[PDB]
Amino acid sequence: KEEAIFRSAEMALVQFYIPQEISRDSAYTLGQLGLVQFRDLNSKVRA
Amino acid sequence: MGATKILMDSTHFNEIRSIIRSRSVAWDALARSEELSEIDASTAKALESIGKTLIPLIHLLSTSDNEDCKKSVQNLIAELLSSDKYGDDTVKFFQEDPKQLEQLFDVSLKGDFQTVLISGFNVVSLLVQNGLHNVKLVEKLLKNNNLINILQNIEQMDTCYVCIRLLQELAVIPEYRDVIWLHEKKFMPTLFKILQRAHLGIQLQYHSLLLIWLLTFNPVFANELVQKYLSDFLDLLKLVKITIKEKVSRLCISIILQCCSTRVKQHKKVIKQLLLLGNALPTVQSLSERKYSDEELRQDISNLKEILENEYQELTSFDEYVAELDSKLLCWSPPHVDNGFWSDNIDEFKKDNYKIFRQLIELLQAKVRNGDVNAKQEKIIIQVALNDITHVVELLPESIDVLDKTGGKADIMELLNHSDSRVKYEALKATQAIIGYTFK
Amino acid sequence: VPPSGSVIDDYVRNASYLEERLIQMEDATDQIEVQKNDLEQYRFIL
Amino acid sequence: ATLQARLGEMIARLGIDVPSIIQVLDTNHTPPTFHRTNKFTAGFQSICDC
Amino acid sequence: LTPNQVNDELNKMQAFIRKEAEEKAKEIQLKADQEYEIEKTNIVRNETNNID
């Protein structure tokens, strides 16, 4: 029940309501899924 | 009402209230069975709905002892007290005539394990209201075997929370604190055990730490807490280190800071040093390196770090090093880094014709000649002495002659084959320093 | 997965301790190498 | 759905009492393109998209 | 699933914000009462020394 190479897959922009305390675990696991990017945010200021 | 004391009603503390309400019976035949009075039947009928009525309720709870009508009455009374629709009048029912509060406590301390907490909810609610403190009733409740055993049943956490949160809510009253601590010798260890193991689990950890923190607000009890159960007090730092929720870490840091405050003159600095000797300083530094999202918690961490840094003056006290020398066993304290942090003590060590060097050599020779290199205390003392000797000798190569005359030049070489890895490594470092300095 | 947690700070402290220890060890090793090289010619004398 | 399930499973494993939620925005901005290619055709897809 | 998602989001926001803030505020108030009592003793101690 998943997409294929017929065309570009159905994209989605979902909103992460990450709790502040559990943020490190949430980010670690979410990166472990190997499934999500992160939209470039607050990049208007120097590094 | 003075307060709600819901404590989130997690798991059983509300599930049992709902289930008991579910099994509600009008008990119309009970009055026909003569177990309940006509006023009692009226109380049951009115309570069937989801001032003067508080008298027949207690009268039935006392006179009628089927314990099932008692469970129903306890559930109804607790629901009425909690219900904000008439909770003001429900609280006034003891805020108007607090005389029957003792009779209610005589009724609350009853029932089975499930119903004991149900009654205790109302008991605490009436007790915690600002209209009546009743320290004697609090002491009597603290003396109840059933509730104490329930609070000691940490195996059933879902029920043990209904006890720990109840006690912590009852501990908010400053007056009840004195009696709370007096019987706390049979309550705190379970709370310490609960914190030792680490929504019910987290809430238990947070509520339990709150009771310890609230009780610790009095320095007189704080000294006893630090002394009698120093193991848990030291482990609180590790618990804060491993805690995931910010609230638990904030509570642990606040408890540690309050314990190590300028108050409690019995150990106002003694306990602070004791923690710093319990591997506290690197943990405090690591916590300082963290970015906890709480201004109060961050300020508390900064204050604790400053206190630890101020207590680190124990290293700079050459008198402290001399005292440790007087002690037969030295500890791996910041004094063991006094020379590196303050080379000034090297002159004192050199003085009196290598007086301190001879003392350290004597300590090492006494440890070796008695063996016991596997003994943990002996191993720690030997390692500290070897590290200090390595620091001193490298700071003044002329002491090599004194060490050789003492036989320590070959003694440390023999100790290079010590059983302990730490001891062997420290001996190797010391010998390399001595051999490297003497090679010039 | 076994996420690290405070073991991250543990790793940081462990790495710092390892550098201080092995930097001391390497200084000791090359200093004593200089020492034995100096004496080896000295021992061969006379 | 599967990422939400995994996040909830982790939250239960992590003991974080506060639930985790996620909502889909109005994707005004152009999202990237994806192809769930297997090893059978990953080479072809990559060479094509070069 | 939208009403279910809305209810779940509302519950998550409630648990993360309202309960946590209420608990933190209650703790702050209790610690503030303790600190006020402690500072009162310092003022009480100084004024008692002056009275003596």
XYZ file of C-alpha atoms in Angstrom:
635
model
C 0.000 0.000 0.000
C 2.755 2.421 -1.001
C 3.762 4.473 -4.017
C 6.018 3.326 -6.864
C 8.285 4.774 -9.558
C 5.336 5.634 -11.808
C 5.811 9.338 -11.031
C 7.006 11.502 -8.167
C 5.512 10.162 -4.957
C 2.756 11.992 -3.097
C 4.606 14.668 -1.138
C 3.501 16.043 2.215
C 4.414 18.832 4.639
C 3.494 17.826 8.190
C 3.983 20.011 11.252
C 6.228 18.749 14.054
C 4.758 19.579 17.478
C 7.857 18.262 19.231
C 7.838 18.539 23.039
C 10.846 20.546 24.176
C 12.069 18.038 26.767
C 11.932 14.926 24.570
C 13.305 16.805 21.563
C 16.634 14.961 21.418
C 15.026 11.501 21.468
C 12.383 12.569 18.951
C 14.982 13.939 16.536
C 17.204 10.876 16.970
C 14.426 8.417 16.182
C 12.898 10.533 13.409
C 16.291 10.575 11.732
C 16.554 6.841 12.356
C 13.465 6.279 10.195
C 15.479 7.578 7.232
C 12.221 9.014 5.956
C 12.030 12.761 6.642
C 13.856 15.905 5.626
C 13.643 19.228 7.446
C 12.548 22.425 5.743
C 15.196 25.147 5.879
C 14.084 27.467 8.682
C 15.547 30.501 10.522
C 18.510 30.603 8.124
C 18.305 34.392 7.696
C 20.963 34.952 10.393
C 24.644 34.024 10.334
C 25.836 30.531 11.234
C -13.714 25.092 48.086
C -10.271 25.679 49.554
C -8.537 23.320 47.131
C -9.202 20.519 44.661
C -6.234 18.195 45.361
C -6.984 16.306 42.147
C -3.328 15.427 41.464
C -4.460 14.614 37.905
C -6.483 11.661 39.270
C -4.160 9.348 37.369
C -5.196 5.726 36.780
C -6.769 4.052 39.832
C -7.409 7.213 41.877
C -10.152 8.118 39.376
C -10.884 4.718 37.822
C -11.988 3.286 41.173
C -14.097 6.380 41.849
C -15.839 5.920 38.495
C -16.286 2.156 38.926
C -17.718 2.561 42.431
C -20.074 5.212 41.070
C -20.959 2.753 38.301
C -21.982 0.058 40.807
C -24.185 2.544 42.677
C -27.291 1.097 44.324
C -30.079 3.152 45.878
C -30.082 0.667 48.798
C -33.851 1.080 49.069
C -34.136 -2.466 50.410
C -31.198 -1.849 52.766
C -33.441 0.376 54.883
C -36.045 -2.362 54.501
C -33.180 -4.624 55.603
C -32.655 -2.228 58.569
C -28.980 -1.730 57.688
C -29.522 1.949 56.813
C -31.775 4.537 58.418
C -34.484 6.398 56.525
C -32.192 9.423 56.578
C -29.467 7.088 55.317
C -31.749 5.957 52.490
C -32.411 9.612 51.653
C -28.654 10.193 51.620
C -28.236 7.287 49.201
C -31.029 8.565 46.939
C -29.580 12.077 46.822
C -26.078 10.689 46.251
C -27.479 8.727 43.314
C -27.296 12.111 41.611
C -23.977 12.199 39.777
C -24.936 21.249 54.019
C -27.059 19.342 56.524
C -26.670 16.178 54.435
C -23.063 15.700 55.584
C -24.303 14.642 59.038
C -26.430 11.615 58.006
C -23.670 10.529 55.627
C -21.136 10.161 58.439
C -23.811 8.802 60.777
C -24.529 6.013 58.289
C -20.834 5.405 57.592
C -20.281 4.893 61.323
C -23.471 3.109 62.403
C -23.944 1.032 59.239
C -20.907 -1.232 58.834
C -21.695 -3.438 55.843
C -18.539 -1.876 54.292
C -20.295 -1.984 50.923
C -22.632 0.803 51.910
C -19.426 2.214 53.400
C -17.587 2.007 50.069
C -20.576 3.606 48.339
C -20.759 6.370 50.953
C -17.038 7.067 50.640
C -17.287 7.285 46.852
C -20.324 9.576 47.054
C -18.721 11.855 49.649
C -15.498 12.135 47.657
C -17.408 12.873 44.452
C -19.482 15.545 46.201
C -16.374 17.152 47.693
C -14.567 17.165 44.345
C -17.602 18.352 42.368
C -17.218 22.111 41.940
C -20.986 22.390 41.407
C -21.331 22.282 45.205
C -17.699 21.802 46.240
C -17.679 25.109 48.103
C -20.476 23.880 50.373
C -18.862 20.437 50.526
C -15.653 21.968 51.884
C -17.711 24.233 54.153
C -19.251 21.074 55.632
C -15.961 20.879 57.517
C -15.226 24.620 57.314
C -18.471 25.263 59.230
C -18.476 22.439 61.818
C -14.949 20.962 61.895
C -15.821 18.960 65.021
C -16.962 15.957 62.975
C -13.637 15.962 61.101
C -12.166 13.602 63.695
C -15.172 11.309 63.277
C -14.630 11.434 59.512
C -10.986 10.441 60.000
C -12.290 7.626 62.190
C -14.405 6.712 59.164
C -11.746 7.381 56.514
C -9.215 5.042 58.160
C -11.240 1.936 57.331
C -12.308 -0.179 54.371
C -10.360 -2.400 52.020
C -7.242 -1.536 50.030
C -9.283 -0.120 47.149
C -11.627 1.819 49.442
C -8.844 3.011 51.769
C -7.498 5.366 49.108
C -11.050 6.410 48.220
C -11.656 7.520 51.799
C -8.186 9.031 52.050
C -8.877 11.313 49.110
C -11.698 12.975 51.051
C -9.667 12.852 54.269
C -6.817 14.785 52.662
C -9.213 17.151 50.893
C -10.888 18.117 54.165
C -7.554 18.169 56.000
C -5.729 20.244 53.372
C -8.445 22.910 53.189
C -7.371 26.183 54.790
C -10.273 26.091 57.262
C -8.809 23.282 59.377
C -5.307 21.855 59.831
C -5.879 19.312 62.640
C -2.292 18.197 63.178
C -3.481 15.399 65.470
C -5.617 13.936 62.685
C -2.619 14.142 60.349
C -0.524 12.236 62.884
C -3.257 9.620 63.285
C -3.418 9.154 59.512
C 0.366 8.832 59.452
C -0.130 6.138 62.109
C -2.615 4.082 60.060
C -1.141 0.710 59.127
C -3.233 0.210 55.984
C -2.299 3.457 54.237
C 1.342 3.101 55.289
C 1.499 -0.417 53.854
C -0.168 0.800 50.650
C 2.410 3.578 50.332
C 5.033 0.893 50.980
C 3.640 -1.265 48.145
C 5.828 0.216 45.416
C 5.229 -2.976 43.423
C 1.744 -1.735 42.483
C 2.844 1.695 41.309
C -0.644 2.521 40.024
C -1.834 2.272 43.626
C 1.335 3.529 45.327
C 0.872 6.825 43.483
C -2.552 7.269 45.087
C -0.642 7.185 48.374
C 2.487 9.192 47.553
C 0.565 12.000 45.854
C -1.915 12.063 48.737
C 0.913 12.436 51.251
C 2.668 15.112 49.190
C -0.564 17.083 48.870
C -1.047 16.755 52.627
C 2.580 17.830 53.104
C 1.913 21.249 51.547
C 0.634 22.488 54.928
C 3.558 23.951 56.921
C 2.012 22.874 60.228
C 1.764 19.197 59.261
C 5.430 19.100 58.211
C 6.762 18.456 61.722
C 4.609 15.372 62.286
C 5.205 14.330 58.670
C 8.953 14.064 59.207
C 8.572 12.367 62.593
C 6.880 9.365 60.982
C 8.841 9.834 57.740
C 11.392 7.231 58.854
C 8.914 4.665 57.484
C 7.794 6.655 54.413
C 10.798 8.412 52.868
C 12.817 5.242 52.032
C 10.029 4.046 49.737
C 10.084 7.445 48.035
C 13.869 7.139 47.918
C 13.430 3.611 46.560
C 10.978 4.889 43.941
C 13.470 7.538 42.849
C 16.159 4.845 42.988
C 14.409 2.694 40.376
C 14.138 5.545 37.863
C 2.382 8.801 32.910
C 2.096 7.076 36.282
C 5.803 6.292 36.507
C 6.917 9.831 35.689
C 4.183 11.433 37.789
C 5.190 9.221 40.709
C 8.786 10.377 40.272
C 7.736 14.032 40.120
C 5.218 13.897 42.965
C 7.567 11.888 45.189
C 10.422 14.338 44.659
C 7.987 17.140 45.490
C 7.266 15.622 48.908
C 10.992 15.299 49.595
C 11.618 18.837 48.346
C 8.705 20.302 50.308
C 9.786 18.552 53.510
C 13.394 19.617 52.894
C 12.373 23.291 53.018
C 13.070 23.108 56.769
C 16.860 22.954 57.293
C 16.531 21.181 60.650
C 14.922 18.192 58.958
C 17.267 18.708 56.000
C 20.340 17.926 58.098
C 18.778 14.638 59.197
C 17.821 13.859 55.599
C 21.387 14.477 54.439
C 22.885 12.449 57.286
C 20.692 9.379 57.803
C 20.066 8.655 54.102
C 23.147 10.234 52.502
C 23.128 7.545 49.805
C 19.862 8.757 48.272
C 20.873 12.400 48.699
C 24.048 11.738 46.718
C 22.193 9.650 44.123
C 19.806 12.558 43.521
C 22.498 14.152 41.343
C 22.662 11.044 39.154
C 18.863 10.945 39.035
C 18.843 14.533 37.770
C 21.509 13.526 35.250
C 19.392 10.682 33.840
C 15.969 12.348 34.109
C 14.258 13.069 30.791
C 11.505 15.414 31.970
C 12.686 18.912 32.836
C 10.426 19.105 35.899
C 12.137 16.146 37.578
C 15.583 17.618 36.934
C 14.489 21.003 38.282
C 13.081 19.403 41.433
C 16.235 17.350 41.996
C 18.507 20.368 41.517
C 16.361 22.460 43.857
C 16.429 19.711 46.494
C 20.212 19.400 46.253
C 20.679 23.172 46.478
C 18.309 23.466 49.446
C 20.142 20.656 51.229
C 23.518 22.292 50.538
C 22.288 25.779 51.455
C 23.871 28.180 53.926
C 21.272 26.966 56.425
C 21.623 23.666 58.300
C 24.811 24.782 60.042
C 25.437 21.194 61.165
C 26.637 20.470 57.624
C 26.137 23.787 55.794
C 29.537 23.164 54.205
C 30.176 19.607 55.426
C 27.423 18.160 53.242
C 28.524 20.303 50.297
C 32.042 18.901 50.590
C 30.594 15.406 51.031
C 28.794 15.687 47.697
C 31.919 17.083 46.031
C 33.700 13.986 47.339
C 30.930 11.876 45.794
C 31.834 12.705 42.177
C 29.489 15.694 42.121
C 31.652 18.433 40.571
C 32.039 16.920 37.058
C 28.307 16.173 37.015
C 27.547 19.772 38.003
C 29.863 20.990 35.246
C 28.110 18.743 32.719
C 24.717 20.036 33.858
C 26.077 23.556 33.424
C 26.994 22.555 29.870
C 23.359 21.540 29.277
C 20.632 23.816 27.880
C 17.602 22.998 30.026
C 14.623 25.111 28.932
C 13.707 26.555 32.321
C 14.960 29.863 33.708
C 14.458 28.705 37.297
C 16.197 25.382 36.629
C 19.068 27.087 34.797
C 19.512 29.590 37.631
C 19.478 26.743 40.157
C 22.111 24.848 38.163
C 24.264 27.978 37.983
C 23.919 28.549 41.732
C 24.844 24.930 42.464
C 27.879 25.207 40.191
C 28.954 28.401 41.956
C 28.526 26.716 45.344
C 30.622 23.756 44.199
C 33.306 26.099 42.858
C 33.385 27.964 46.175
C 33.652 24.650 48.041
C 36.552 23.759 45.728
C 38.606 26.009 48.025
C 39.275 22.795 49.961
C 41.989 22.153 47.366
C 43.714 25.517 47.824
C 43.862 24.964 51.605
C 47.315 23.530 52.240
C 45.958 23.077 55.761
C 43.412 20.670 54.282
C 46.230 18.719 52.628
C 48.098 18.673 55.945
C 44.966 17.387 57.687
C 44.579 14.651 55.080
C 48.221 13.796 55.761
C 47.328 13.516 59.445
C 44.570 11.157 58.347
C 45.976 7.701 57.685
C 44.021 7.517 54.404
C 43.735 10.306 51.846
C 40.788 10.648 49.475
C 40.769 11.570 45.797
C 39.651 15.119 46.598
C 40.620 18.378 44.857
C 43.420 18.467 47.447
C 44.901 15.659 45.345
C 45.239 18.355 42.663
C 46.416 21.075 45.073
C 49.970 21.124 43.702
C 48.964 21.333 40.043
C 46.319 23.955 40.789
C 48.574 25.690 43.354
C 52.309 24.990 43.082
C 52.805 27.108 46.224
C 52.356 24.053 48.467
C 55.465 22.513 46.877
C 57.614 24.829 49.004
C 55.841 23.689 52.174
C 56.282 20.060 51.125
C 60.000 20.639 50.534
C 60.364 22.441 53.864
C 61.622 20.776 57.055
C 64.011 18.658 54.967
C 61.332 16.995 52.830
C 58.915 16.713 55.756
C 55.790 16.171 53.654
C 57.693 13.939 51.226
C 58.827 11.770 54.140
C 55.257 11.684 55.461
C 53.925 10.553 52.076
C 56.711 7.980 51.739
C 55.832 6.704 55.208
C 52.164 6.402 54.246
C 53.033 4.500 51.064
C 55.467 2.226 52.910
C 52.860 1.505 55.583
C 50.274 0.651 52.929
C 52.677 -1.587 50.996
C 54.221 -3.331 54.014
C 50.683 -4.247 55.072
C 49.826 -5.228 51.499
C 46.056 -5.176 50.963
C 46.531 -3.676 47.502
C 43.148 -5.124 46.490
C 41.341 -3.297 49.315
C 39.224 -0.542 47.783
C 39.938 2.010 50.512
C 43.600 0.995 50.617
C 43.829 1.111 46.819
C 42.290 4.592 46.725
C 44.645 5.837 49.442
C 47.677 4.350 47.682
C 46.639 5.853 44.342
C 46.095 9.303 45.864
C 49.442 9.145 47.660
C 51.233 8.025 44.496
C 49.664 10.819 42.440
C 50.560 13.433 45.051
C 54.115 12.082 45.274
C 54.441 12.201 41.486
C 53.225 15.800 41.471
C 55.634 16.787 44.256
C 58.719 15.007 42.903
C 58.239 16.418 39.404
C 57.853 19.850 41.016
C 61.244 19.528 42.766
C 63.800 17.012 41.450
C 65.961 17.478 44.559
C 63.380 15.393 46.441
C 64.536 12.380 44.398
C 67.468 11.948 46.784
C 65.109 12.031 49.772
C 62.852 9.458 48.114
C 65.793 7.177 47.301
C 67.139 7.392 50.855
C 63.661 6.404 52.060
C 63.692 3.373 49.765
C 60.711 4.756 47.857
C 62.652 4.839 44.591
C 62.591 1.035 44.520
C 59.306 0.837 46.444
C 57.385 2.595 43.667
C 59.178 0.421 41.111
C 57.960 -2.673 42.950
C 54.489 -1.098 43.157
C 54.511 -0.750 39.361
C 53.367 -4.400 39.368
C 50.373 -3.616 41.598
C 47.248 -5.697 41.070
C 44.896 -2.753 40.531
C 44.876 -1.209 37.067
C 44.489 2.299 38.493
C 47.231 1.653 41.056
C 49.562 0.219 38.411
C 48.905 3.122 36.038
C 49.479 5.732 38.753
C 52.680 3.964 39.802
C 53.865 3.924 36.188
C 53.184 7.652 35.867
C 55.017 8.376 39.124
C 58.013 6.231 38.160
C 58.196 7.847 34.719
C 58.161 11.265 36.381
C 60.883 10.225 38.839
C 63.001 8.399 36.256
C 62.525 11.221 33.760
C 63.490 13.871 36.306
C 66.470 11.896 37.627
C 67.749 11.188 34.105
C 68.696 14.865 33.693
C 17.728 1.480 18.804
C 19.709 2.162 22.015
C 19.832 5.976 22.034
C 22.646 7.425 24.099
C 21.246 10.143 26.359
C 23.529 11.339 29.150
C 25.982 8.780 27.770
C 26.775 11.578 25.300
C 28.217 13.642 28.148
C 29.820 10.442 29.426
C 31.515 9.997 26.039
C 32.670 13.626 26.058
C 34.248 13.284 29.498
C 35.719 9.911 28.525
C 37.379 11.393 25.435
C 38.807 14.323 27.396
C 40.169 11.931 30.028
C 41.694 9.743 27.319
C 43.483 12.703 25.733
C 44.894 13.940 29.011
C 46.066 10.435 29.938
C 47.556 9.438 26.585
C 49.116 12.874 26.043
C 50.877 12.388 29.369
C 51.736 8.843 28.266
C 53.165 9.967 24.915
C 55.191 12.713 26.589
C 56.550 10.101 28.992
C 57.346 7.680 26.161
C 59.226 10.097 23.931
C 60.981 11.719 26.909
C 62.246 8.326 28.062
C 63.144 7.500 24.453
C 65.351 10.589 24.478
C 66.719 9.393 27.824
C 67.629 5.884 26.655
C 69.077 7.196 23.389
C 71.341 9.520 25.386
C 72.551 6.801 27.760
C 72.995 4.161 25.042
C 75.925 6.096 23.595
C 77.015 6.937 27.149
C 76.866 3.266 28.150
C 78.905 2.277 25.083
C 81.622 4.721 26.174
C 84.602 3.603 28.269
C 0.470 7.159 9.585
C 3.516 4.935 10.037
C 5.756 7.797 11.166
C 3.096 8.897 13.654
C 2.851 5.318 14.925
C 6.632 5.083 15.321
C 6.754 8.437 17.127
C 3.991 7.355 19.503
C 5.727 4.038 20.142
C 8.941 5.885 20.990
C 7.082 8.340 23.238
C 5.607 5.390 25.121
C 9.091 3.859 25.272
C 10.561 7.191 26.400
C 7.867 7.589 29.059
C 7.024 11.131 27.922
C 3.515 11.583 29.318
C 2.670 14.510 27.011
C 1.304 13.162 23.703
C 2.942 14.014 20.385
C 0.862 15.490 17.556
C 1.453 16.401 13.917
C -0.631 18.258 11.330
C -0.279 18.809 7.585
C 0.220 22.405 6.449
C -1.104 24.118 3.333
C 1.756 23.170 1.022
C 2.015 26.460 -0.864
C 5.747 25.874 -1.321
C 6.872 23.298 -3.862
C 7.728 19.991 -2.147
C 10.598 17.811 -3.378
C 10.275 14.844 -5.710
C 10.701 11.261 -4.535
C 10.939 7.851 -6.193
C 10.743 4.693 -4.069
C 13.138 2.879 -6.372
C 14.453 -0.567 -5.489
C 17.936 -1.867 -6.281
C 16.417 -3.227 -9.498
C 16.026 0.267 -10.948
C 17.888 2.686 -8.658
C 20.721 2.920 -11.173
C 18.356 3.731 -14.028
C 16.532 6.339 -11.952
C 19.749 8.016 -10.803
C 21.229 8.081 -14.301
C 17.986 9.546 -15.644
C 17.825 12.261 -12.985
C 21.491 13.194 -13.438
C -9.713 11.251 11.329
C -9.700 15.048 11.522
C -11.950 15.252 14.634
C -9.855 12.487 16.196
C -6.666 14.310 15.197
C -8.070 17.596 16.520
C -8.997 15.987 19.847
C -5.582 14.319 20.121
C -3.821 17.612 19.377
C -5.962 19.419 21.955
C -5.207 16.767 24.583
C -1.482 16.876 23.793
C -1.433 20.673 24.009
C -3.355 20.548 27.292
C -1.016 18.000 28.878
C 2.122 19.760 27.636
C 1.054 23.306 28.516
C -1.776 23.684 31.018
C -0.918 20.909 33.479
C 2.830 21.543 33.296
C 2.404 25.293 33.805
C -0.023 24.766 36.689
C 2.378 22.364 38.402
C 5.352 24.676 37.854
C 3.393 27.679 39.134
C 2.274 25.770 42.228
C 5.872 24.720 42.882
C 7.042 28.307 42.381
C 4.381 29.572 44.790
C 5.320 26.992 47.427
C 9.031 27.766 47.115
C 8.159 31.467 47.237
C 6.241 30.962 50.478
C 9.240 29.101 51.902
C 11.626 31.844 50.756
C 9.334 34.534 52.172
C 9.305 32.724 55.512
C 13.104 32.428 55.425
C 13.635 36.100 54.555
C 11.109 37.060 57.228
C 13.303 35.257 59.759
C 16.307 37.316 58.635
C 14.291 40.515 59.061
C 12.872 39.091 62.293
C 16.374 38.189 63.486
C 17.749 41.660 62.722
C 14.822 43.430 64.384
C 15.023 41.116 67.412
C 18.726 41.931 67.739
C 17.855 45.634 67.561
C 15.142 45.164 70.202
C 17.567 43.312 72.481
